[PDB]
Amino acid sequence: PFFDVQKRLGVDLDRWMTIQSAEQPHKIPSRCHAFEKEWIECAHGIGSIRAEKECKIEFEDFRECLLRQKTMKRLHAIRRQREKLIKEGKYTPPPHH
Amino acid sequence: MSMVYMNIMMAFTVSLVGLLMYRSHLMSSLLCLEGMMLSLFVMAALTILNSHFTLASMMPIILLVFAACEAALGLSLLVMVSNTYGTDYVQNLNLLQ
Amino acid sequence: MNLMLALLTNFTLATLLVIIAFWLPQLNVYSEKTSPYECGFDPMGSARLPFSMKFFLVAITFLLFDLEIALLLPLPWASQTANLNTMLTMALFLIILLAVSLAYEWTQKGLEWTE
Amino acid sequence: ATFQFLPDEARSLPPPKLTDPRLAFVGFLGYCSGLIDNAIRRRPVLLAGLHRQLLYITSFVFVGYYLLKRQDYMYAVRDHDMFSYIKSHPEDFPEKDKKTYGEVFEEFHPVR
Amino acid sequence: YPTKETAHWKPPPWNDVDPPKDTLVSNLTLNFGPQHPAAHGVLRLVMELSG
Amino acid sequence: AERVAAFLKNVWAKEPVLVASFAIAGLAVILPTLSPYTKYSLMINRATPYNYPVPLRDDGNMPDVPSHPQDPQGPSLEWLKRL
Amino acid sequence: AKTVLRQYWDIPEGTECHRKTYATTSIGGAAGLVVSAYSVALKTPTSFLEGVARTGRYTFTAAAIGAIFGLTSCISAQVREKPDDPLNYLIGGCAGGLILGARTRSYGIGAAACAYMGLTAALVKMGQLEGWQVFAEPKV
Amino acid sequence: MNPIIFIIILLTIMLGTIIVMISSHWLLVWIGFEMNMLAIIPIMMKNHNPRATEASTKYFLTQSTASMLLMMAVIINLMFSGQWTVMKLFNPMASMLMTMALAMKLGMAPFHFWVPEVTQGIPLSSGLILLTWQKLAPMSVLYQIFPSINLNLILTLSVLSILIGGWGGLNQTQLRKIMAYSSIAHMGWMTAVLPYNPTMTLLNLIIYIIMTSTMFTMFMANSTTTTLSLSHTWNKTPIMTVLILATLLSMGGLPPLSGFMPKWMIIQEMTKNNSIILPTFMAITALLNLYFYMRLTYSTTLTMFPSTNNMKMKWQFPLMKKMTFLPTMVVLSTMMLPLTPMLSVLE
Amino acid sequence: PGIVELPSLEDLKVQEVKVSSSVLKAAAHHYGAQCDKPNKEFMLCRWEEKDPRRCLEEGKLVNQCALEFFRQIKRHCAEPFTEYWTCIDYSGLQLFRRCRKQQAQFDECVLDKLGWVRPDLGDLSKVTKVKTDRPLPENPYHSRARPEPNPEVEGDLKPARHGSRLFFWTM
Amino acid sequence: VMKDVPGWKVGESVFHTTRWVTPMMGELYGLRASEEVLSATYGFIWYT
Amino acid sequence: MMLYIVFILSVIFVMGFVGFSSKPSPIYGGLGLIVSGGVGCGIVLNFGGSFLGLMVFLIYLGGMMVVFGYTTAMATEQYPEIWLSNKAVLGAFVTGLLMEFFMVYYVLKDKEVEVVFEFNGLGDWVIYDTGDSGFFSEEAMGIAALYSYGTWLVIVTGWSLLIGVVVIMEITRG
Numbered sequence A: 001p002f003f004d005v006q007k008r009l010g011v012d013l014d015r016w017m018t019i020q021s022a023e024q025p026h027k028i029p030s031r032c033h034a035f036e037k038e039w040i041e042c043a044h045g046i047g048s049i050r051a052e053k054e055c056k057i058e059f060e061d062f063r064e065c066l067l068r069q070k071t072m073k074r075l076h077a078i079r080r081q082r083e084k085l086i087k088e089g090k091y092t093p094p095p096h097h
Numbered sequence B: 001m002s003m004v005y006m007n008i009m010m011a012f013t014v015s016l017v018g019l020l021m022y023r024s025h026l027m028s029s030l031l032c033l034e035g036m037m038l039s040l041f042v043m044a045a046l047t048i049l050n051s052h053f054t055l056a057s058m059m060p061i062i063l064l065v066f067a068a069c070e071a072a073l074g075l076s077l078l079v080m081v082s083n084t085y086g087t088d089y090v091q092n093l094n095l096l097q
Numbered sequence C: 001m002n003l004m005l006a007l008l009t010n011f012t013l014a015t016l017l018v019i020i021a022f023w024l025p026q027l028n029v030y031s032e033k034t035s036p037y038e039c040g041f042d043p044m045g046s047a048r049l050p051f052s053m054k055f056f057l058v059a060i061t062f063l064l065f066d067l068e069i070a071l072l073l074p075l076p077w078a079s080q081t082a083n084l085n086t087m088l089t090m091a092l093f094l095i096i097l098l099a100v101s102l103a104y105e106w107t108q109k110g111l112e113w114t115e
Numbered sequence D: 001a002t003f004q005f006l007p008d009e010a011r012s013l014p015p016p017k018l019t020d021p022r023l024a025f026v027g028f029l030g031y032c033s034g035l036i037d038n039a040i041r042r043r044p045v046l047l048a049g050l051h052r053q054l055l056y057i058t059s060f061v062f063v064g065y066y067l068l069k070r071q072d073y074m075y076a077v078r079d080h081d082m083f084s085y086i087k088s089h090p091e092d093f094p095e096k097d098k099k100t101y102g103e104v105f106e107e108f109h110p111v112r
Numbered sequence E: 001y002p003t004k005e006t007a008h009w010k011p012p013p014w015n016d017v018d019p020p021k022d023t024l025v026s027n028l029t030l031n032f033g034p035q036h037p038a039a040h041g042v043l044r045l046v047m048e049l050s051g
Numbered sequence F: 001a002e003r004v005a006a007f008l009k010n011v012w013a014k015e016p017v018l019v020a021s022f023a024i025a026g027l028a029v030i031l032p033t034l035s036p037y038t039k040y041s042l043m044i045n046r047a048t049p050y051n052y053p054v055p056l057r058d059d060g061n062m063p064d065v066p067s068h069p070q071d072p073q074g075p076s077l078e079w080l081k082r083l
Numbered sequence G: 001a002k003t004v005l006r007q008y009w010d011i012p013e014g015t016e017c018h019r020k021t022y023a024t025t026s027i028g029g030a031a032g033l034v035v036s037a038y039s040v041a042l043k044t045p046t047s048f049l050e051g052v053a054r055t056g057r058y059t060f061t062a063a064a065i066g067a068i069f070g071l072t073s074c075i076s077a078q079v080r081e082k083p084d085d086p087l088n089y090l091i092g093g094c095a096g097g098l099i100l101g102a103r104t105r106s107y108g109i110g111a112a113a114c115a116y117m118g119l120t121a122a123l124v125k126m127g128q129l130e131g132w133q134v135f136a137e138p139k140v
Numbered sequence H: 001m002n003p004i005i006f007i008i009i010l011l012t013i014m015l016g017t018i019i020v021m022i023s024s025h026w027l028l029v030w031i032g033f034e035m036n037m038l039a040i041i042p043i044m045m046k047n048h049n050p051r052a053t054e055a056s057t058k059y060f061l062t063q064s065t066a067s068m069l070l071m072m073a074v075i076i077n078l079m080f081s082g083q084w085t086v087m088k089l090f091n092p093m094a095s096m097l098m099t100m101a102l103a104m105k106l107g108m109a110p111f112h113f114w115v116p117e118v119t120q121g122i123p124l125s126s127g128l129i130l131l132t133w134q135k136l137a138p139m140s141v142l143y144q145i146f147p148s149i150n151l152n153l154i155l156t157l158s159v160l161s162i163l164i165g166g167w168g169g170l171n172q173t174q175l176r177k178i179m180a181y182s183s184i185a186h187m188g189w190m191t192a193v194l195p196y197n198p199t200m201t202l203l204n205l206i207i208y209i210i211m212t213s214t215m216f217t218m219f220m221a222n223s224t225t226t227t228l229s230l231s232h233t234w235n236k237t238p239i240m241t242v243l244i245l246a247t248l249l250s251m252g253g254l255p256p257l258s259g260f261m262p263k264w265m266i267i268q269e270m271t272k273n274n275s276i277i278l279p280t281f282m283a284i285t286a287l288l289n290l291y292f293y294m295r296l297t298y299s300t301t302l303t304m305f306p307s308t309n310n311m312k313m314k315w316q317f318p319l320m321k322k323m324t325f326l327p328t329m330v331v332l333s334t335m336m337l338p339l340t341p342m343l344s345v346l347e
Numbered sequence I: 001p002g003i004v005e006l007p008s009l010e011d012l013k014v015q016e017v018k019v020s021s022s023v024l025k026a027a028a029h030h031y032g033a034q035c036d037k038p039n040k041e042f043m044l045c046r047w048e049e050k051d052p053r054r055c056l057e058e059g060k061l062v063n064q065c066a067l068e069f070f071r072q073i074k075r076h077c078a079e080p081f082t083e084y085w086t087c088i089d090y091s092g093l094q095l096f097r098r099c100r101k102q103q104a105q106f107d108e109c110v111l112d113k114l115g116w117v118r119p120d121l122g123d124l125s126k127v128t129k130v131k132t133d134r135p136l137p138e139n140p141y142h143s144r145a146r147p148e149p150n151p152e153v154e155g156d157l158k159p160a161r162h163g164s165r166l167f168f169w170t171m
Numbered sequence J: 001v002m003k004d005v006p007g008w009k010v011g012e013s014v015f016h017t018t019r020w021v022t023p024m025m026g027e028l029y030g031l032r033a034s035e036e037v038l039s040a041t042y043g044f045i046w047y048t
Numbered sequence K: 001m002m003l004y005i006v007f008i009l010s011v012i013f014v015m016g017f018v019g020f021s022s023k024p025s026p027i028y029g030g031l032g033l034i035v036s037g038g039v040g041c042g043i044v045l046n047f048g049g050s051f052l053g054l055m056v057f058l059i060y061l062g063g064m065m066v067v068f069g070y071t072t073a074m075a076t077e078q079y080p081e082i083w084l085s086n087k088a089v090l091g092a093f094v095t096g097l098l099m100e101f102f103m104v105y106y107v108l109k110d111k112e113v114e115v116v117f118e119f120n121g122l123g124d125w126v127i128y129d130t131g132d133s134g135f136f137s138e139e140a141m142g143i144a145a146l147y148s149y150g151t152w153l154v155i156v157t158g159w160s161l162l163i164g165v166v167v168i169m170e171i172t173r174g
């Protein structure tokens, strides 16, 4: 904050909601709990200038969990190829797929 | 990103252009403002629900509470504009040129 | 699915009834029959003219009160919290502030309709 | 410290002297404010409300003393950081091998 | 600096209050009867309503 | 106490609806403090198990942690059986 | 603008004038369009044609200035065998200022535009020769 | 407005600003902005005339639109980071939307059109709140997100604000429109140095607030809102004209006055980053601000315009306006250059 | 970025407890007491390993103890148990309170024949310790080494050398 | 399915970490019948 | 086809927005916003937010009811404008629908579409969570935490609503 009155007075007005790795009701975890915690622990105390560079792996994995962009691209690649092979009479799906 | 985001983001943009391109009725523009909150509410809810961040499930509710205040504030001004000129037309609000 | 099926059937039946109502009866349409109704004499002006709202201030206050319910509707779930000391204080706080806002508008004649 | 006007580590610095020239200037500024207050309200400028004039001076000096102490502390902090960083990174602050002007060459530009 | 686009500009009012509009707000006019349950069948009560 | 009675009786004659509201609102605020059962409400909310009770890795010095759910050690709900 | 600006600097000075002029003409037209958008938005034309006719003058005036600047600056260097000469942009800048004065019907603007646009362009040429930054990266 | 209601509303305006400044969560920052806008409109509408109604409506439409873009940036940040902490933003599209949202809230060019009109339409006391207190909350958010702000965007706004503020003031005869355009110009300096040294943004902000507060307080004292109405001050309160002169010269950045300090410090910071063309351009363009400050000193203090006969009746009555803090603010507005190194307290 | 290691289809095969949920619900309370030890070890494994692949073997011992549990009911209490879950199965919410009479018959059958006792209210929700020989995982998050902290700036605070050093100022 | 795709690697991870990641719906039911996917995704939400 | 339930609702969502963004008579703008609130509730419901979805629908139904009343008093003319009655309204309405259609066509034609930013058109189900067996609603526990965890949020929201009543009365007391 601009004025960190929360840290000074010890009150906790809104930090509880800031991250998804914080204590949740009945300990329900967020989907990307592990990825957040790793990134938060990697970058703790070293500052954004360093963290932008020395925690790219943790952040890049965390971003993948959040938006799943690499995964969906992989699935679209697999799905698209099956269409090509199914349509060419080349591959046939097994009963369970 | 997921395909739902495409239409929700498009919805926000449509209402944003809706608000910025005025016609005559000031009431019409106040609807484009409630339109922007509706899309912001929906898009926030999808992100929060999908990621299983429990504590922010209250965030969209708080968003609506301060949208109601803005709409009530906007309608109050429309009452006084109408009481002065006999319409809600925005071209009447040009004394300060 | 069931809910979508149920909604479609409801509004499908309603539309079918309207369709039947419009195409079964014999119609005889002419200008006087379809003219706007107003007790036998022609309307004096447009029904699209402005219609003053005397309860306008109550109507805006409804928007603010109508959002108190969204904040209060979670109360049955909140009653299951471990931290009941904080709950009850905050639940009572919201309702009192809602009561105070109502008292303020009441004492300042905000609920009286304008003449 | 976080959100603290004077963190505890600041007490290792010598406090501003009560006769600091910067503090005397602040006290003077309070005097001028006291005089302007008489002027705008149209009272005798030098004479009126000496009780009010003393409070203008006292309050300025009071606030100025703490501002000068924080000012001094923040400059001590800047030096403390700078010197330790130079200690922590010897390779980036190497001593210059200092030639003398007898050895160094400078091209001469006549002023004709 | 006068310009042709600002030739119609007047200085604002001294006390910031512009005159109220001369416009007359129009009240809705209604035929209440004759064909009306509360008109006794033959009263054409022409009312001017505000709301 | 006499001035208030006249006001109190006056409002019972003119605004009995508002007299009833403030009285009920007052009770809603006061009784939770003075009730001997209010403590049990939080205990019953505490005793409802929404989540799995994850076991502990026994290290050798956990005298009060039970080894089996039916062992005597651990919180008991006997107070609730009789509430 | 970033890519269009880069290609202008990509090609060597004094050579490939047709390409240089295409760059400055593109920079001229874009500037005219931006002025046209704000102009029509804030000063509404009476009719749709006059809104187009106003876009026509500003965009053409701006495109003409840039085309003449790029042409004159390139040709001047080509003739004089001095690519990295700041003076070449001085001539390009004045010619542009003259186009504005010619397009505007006013010897007062044409002269003033010559000087200010002439000095501005030479500073631009000085700027990239010496590496001057207008929006400098924070470094300390 | 009942006095108690005015105080509670006035405390709510401050509360929203304080919530923005102490919040570590983007939602609470947005709430603080909404709370502030809710409470300020009734102060704008206080006198209930068509002009005040127009100003409040134009203000509400502008601030509401900014809040939408601001909240949009927050939700985009949430998608690409999963967190709400107030700090750098993790998406460049979110950075642009927030930067523009804050630019409208400040009234920076080219989102400036509302500042001259809202200021002219409301009382002087309300205009003082609008041009001073309302700058704190948006600036404090910019002070925290600056590491992710696009440099070209922020500097483009600063340059445009300085130019548009400078040129806009030249044509004004109303004191409230002069203060609006002067405010737009000064906001440009604050954001221009923001990418390089945020401390000099705070210094410029504080000194701008002290000098703007002083000018509005002197306008309120004599109830003057036009250039000509102010030109009568010499014939009632000669002392006031001298304070207006010194404060106006300080606002123009003339040494050895306090107003020279923020301009002096900002030039130092920009040159340390090898930014030479921009501070030179900025300093010269600020001469436009000085020009229309000097006209006011000509008509106010250095000459004597004609009076009217009825002015003699005002000679018999004393000023009764509060003029709260005026003696202190004017001294701080003028005699602080010798204390410039005290700017390290803002560090 | 690696090829996810997935077990073979033979390493996943196991005898399945193929009974309905009303059957499991009917026997849940006794099942919780009888098969506590294998179950608790398996659940300790999952919340420690954080990996379903690292707990397969303990997950098979969960089924083998479940099948043995249901094999004892079949040997001694087949008929009383069969009435009871049938009563549970009828209910839309599989409520206990609608089958207390049949629950008794099954409850004294398992007490007389097998010696089983039903857990009390709150027993099955206790946190219990469990001894194991599986070593505690050391990097269950597969965390990389964290970056080093910024070297601490410490020492004795001294006055700024020649003060602010701002242009001409001597203090 | 991907045999004849050249750059492909079968069973590759999108994550730099080797830690186990819970699969999402598309990863688990990606290559299966629509009604099986539909029941897995919206079965609960749609159930009456 | 049913797997695309959320996408189909989002298409009607945008169409409702084009309904009121084109800005016909506020009578019809309110209708457009009611539709968008409806399918907007449907979208959020399909992500597991039954409470959040139903409430945005409920709040917006009351709000448009107030808007309808205010339209008849202060935003009505002799010939209220429908989408077909005005060239500017129709032009905006047509433009928004064509811009909506083409985005739909490409994303369905290819399973991905680029509209300024890359969007995957595999259907929205693919991102859903696989496992789930808690005996509660997660949205309900999160929303119910407003009273235990969100003490600070309740104070600021309660205050703002109280001030809102005070403010609207000041503004409307000419």
Ligand SMILES: CCCCCCCCCCCCCCCCCC(=O)OC[C@H](COP(=O)(O)OCCN)OC(=O)CCCCCCCCCCCCCCCCC
Pocket (backbone or CB within 6 Å): D020, D021, D022, D024, D025, D026, D028, H256, H337, H338, H339, I168, I169, I170, I171
């Ligand atoms: C301002 C005085 C000059 C008046 C003419 C106005 C000139 C234009 C001002 C523009 C800014 C330039 C300021 C230049 C002065 C600051 C440079 C400086 O002197 O810094 C050092 C000063 C302490 O001075 P030092 O060398 O240590 O000698 C101590 C002797 N007792 O530490 C300081 O920073 C103190 C500076 C405040 C001024 C000197 C205070 C003297 C102590 C008595 C209080 C002042 C009362 C008289 C007020 C005079 C007002 C004209």
Ligand SMILES: CCCCCCCCCCCCCCCCCC(=O)OC[C@H](COP(=O)(O)OCCN)OC(=O)CCCCCCCCCCCCCCCCC
Pocket (backbone or CB within 6 Å): D032, D035, D036, D039, D043, D044, D045, D046, D047, H239
């Ligand atoms: C060491 C001081 C150096 C000063 C350097 C000045 C630097 C610039 C400072 C700017 C601030 C200036 C003060 C603010 C303006 C106040 C003065 C004013 O408004 O007008 C002049 C005023 C005379 O107006 P008048 O109505 O007659 O007031 C009655 C006074 N007898 O009031 C006056 O009479 C003139 C006031 C200025 C003179 C100050 C005198 C210093 C204090 C002397 C102590 C008192 C001595 C008493 C002597 C009598 C007993 C023997």
Ligand SMILES: CCCCCCCCCCCCCCCCCC(=O)OC[C@H](COP(=O)(O)OCCN)OC(=O)CCCCCCCCCCCCCCCCC
Pocket (backbone or CB within 6 Å): D026, D037, D051, D052, D053, D055, D056, D059, D060, D062, D063, D064, D067, H323, H324, H325, H326, H328, H339
């Ligand atoms: C950056 C480096 C420079 C640092 C600069 C420091 C600036 C901050 C310092 C504070 C500046 C303001 C100083 C005000 C001095 C004048 C106060 C005074 O004399 O008041 C006289 C009288 C009221 O006095 P009284 O309220 O009884 O004092 C007790 C206060 N609780 O009533 C009166 O007639 C006074 C009327 C004139 C005052 C203007 C109106 C303001 C009212 C203020 C109320 C009292 C403030 C108490 C000041 C204490 C400050 C420690």
Ligand SMILES: CCCCCCCCCCCCCCCCCC(=O)OC[C@H](COP(=O)(O)OCCN)OC(=O)CCCCCCCCCCCCCCCCC
Pocket (backbone or CB within 6 Å): D038, D039, D040, D042, D043, H238, H239, H241, H242, H243, H245, H246, H249, H256, H257, H301, H302, H330, H331, H334, H335, H336, H338
């Ligand atoms: C030391 C470090 C700091 C360095 C920075 C510079 C310090 C100076 C800052 C000044 C701050 C403002 C305070 C100035 C006090 C002025 C006092 C004064 O001039 O006398 C007031 C006089 C009142 O006239 P009278 O009617 O007799 O009395 C009524 C009031 N009781 O008024 C009049 O009658 C005059 C009317 C005619 C107007 C004449 C205008 C030209 C002369 C103005 C001189 C002051 C210039 C100030 C500008 C800044 C200069 C640096």
Ligand SMILES: CCCCCCCCCCCCO[C@@H]1O[C@H](CO)[C@@H](O[C@H]2O[C@H](CO)[C@@H](O)[C@H](O)[C@H]2O)[C@H](O)[C@H]1O
Pocket (backbone or CB within 6 Å): C084, C085, C086, C088, C089, C092, C093, C096, F029, F032, F033, F034, F038, F039, F040, F041, F042, F043
């Ligand atoms: C204008 C602003 C108006 C603000 C008005 C706010 C009114 C709030 C009144 C206090 C309401 C709660 O009051 C408080 O409730 C809790 C129960 O939840 C009680 O607490 C009691 O029960 C709880 C659990 O239920 C036990 O953990 C605790 O041991 C016991 O003390 C407190 O004894 C009582 O003092």
Ligand SMILES: CCCCCCCCCCCCO[C@@H]1O[C@H](CO)[C@@H](O[C@H]2O[C@H](CO)[C@@H](O)[C@H](O)[C@H]2O)[C@H](O)[C@H]1O
Pocket (backbone or CB within 6 Å): C095, C096, C099, C100, C102, C103, C104, C106, C107, C108, C109, F015, F018, F021, F022, F025
């Ligand atoms: C915590 C929830 C329960 C607490 C109750 C909260 C709501 C309190 C409502 C306000 C009560 C006091 O405020 C109210 O002000 C008006 C002034 O116009 C009073 O007086 C008015 O009321 C009645 C009915 O309108 C009129 O017949 C009377 O002529 C008028 O004077 C009311 O008698 C009083 O009830």
Ligand SMILES: CCCCCCCCCCCCO[C@@H]1O[C@H](CO)[C@@H](O[C@H]2O[C@H](CO)[C@@H](O)[C@H](O)[C@H]2O)[C@H](O)[C@H]1O
Pocket (backbone or CB within 6 Å): A069, B001, B009, B010, B013, B016, H076, H091, H092, H093, H094, K117, K118
């Ligand atoms: C004023 C109108 C406002 C309308 C708002 C419309 C919605 C805006 C959507 C904002 C999010 C768009 O997100 C934008 O596109 C994709 C998102 O994966 C990113 O794509 C790019 O960045 C990331 C960075 O790691 C990488 O995938 C890669 O560099 C590249 O693909 C962009 O860096 C991002 O800026």
